[PDB]
Design a binder for this molecule. Sequence first.
Ligand SMILES: Nc1nc2c(ncn2[C@@H]2O[C@H](COP(=O)(O)OP(=O)(O)NP(=O)(O)O)[C@@H](O)[C@H]2O)c(=O)[nH]1
Ligand SMILES: [Mg+2]
Length: 283
Amino acid sequence: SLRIVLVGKTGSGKSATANTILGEEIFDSRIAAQAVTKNCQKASREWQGRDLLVVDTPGLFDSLDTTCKEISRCIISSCPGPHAIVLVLQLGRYTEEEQKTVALIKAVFGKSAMKHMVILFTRKEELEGQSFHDFIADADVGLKSIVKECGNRCCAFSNSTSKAEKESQVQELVELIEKMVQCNEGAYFSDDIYKDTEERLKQREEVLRKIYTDQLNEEIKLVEEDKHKSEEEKEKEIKLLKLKYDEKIKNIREEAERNIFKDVFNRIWKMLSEIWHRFLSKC
Ligand SMILES: Nc1nc2c(ncn2[C@@H]2O[C@H](COP(=O)(O)OP(=O)(O)NP(=O)(O)O)[C@@H](O)[C@H]2O)c(=O)[nH]1
Ligand SMILES: [Mg+2]
């Protein structure tokens, strides 16, 4: 299993990138004068060997409230921790919004997060006769710097362009991610946040297990000691109940993720309120 999070500016091609990872178009990718993704979204894909889990995020910079909301959502979805945090840029310069984005990940998740960051570019088809190598070779101090921090993990993507090319890019991305993780002591990203937020997640899931079971064992109890009902009626009812139960265990993960939101939000809000002086737009 691979947990990857796509963060970046608005319009950078995050959703497109997600689509090309997922093999089909799930998320909304189009050209806009607005944010097309207003909400953290997640999906899964059957791959050669693994289940790929892709977290698409709203464009980081456009609100302390909103930023805190979406980050928190991102954290919950990415639990227990992400394998790769992919910073998505349009081809060319490393710009101020990406600078602040990188600053944010650093600030909230520590500097220790930069081992799991990979840089991904979109519009690969736009460079034409120039090599991507040649491309990153002409780069600037800031781009070179962040590439260095990220361990020289860089990709270019063409979302348009055949499936076989696209899936090959997927091979590149996934492989490098596995390389990175292996060199990273073979585990996902784990933070003070992630540990706590996961513990909460586990606690509430076990709780809901206590709830749903005690609900089903009760509904069953009525049917057993109920008279005037045929045994076939008892059996048909209980069978349906058990079906609804097995459907309701499938539900716990999504329902659990919803319960902790405000708690993690508050925790992040405590932290982030002080810090926001760094991410204001001056002027
Ligand atoms: N040529 C080309 N265009 C691309 C590529 N990736 C994205 N685009 C273009 O960039 C536009 C923005 O796509 P989108 O995925 O919506 O960006 P986004 O990151 O989702 N924006 P947001 O995060 O606000 O929803 C699309 O209309 C698409 O045509 C790429 O690899 N090549
Ligand atoms: Mg989007």
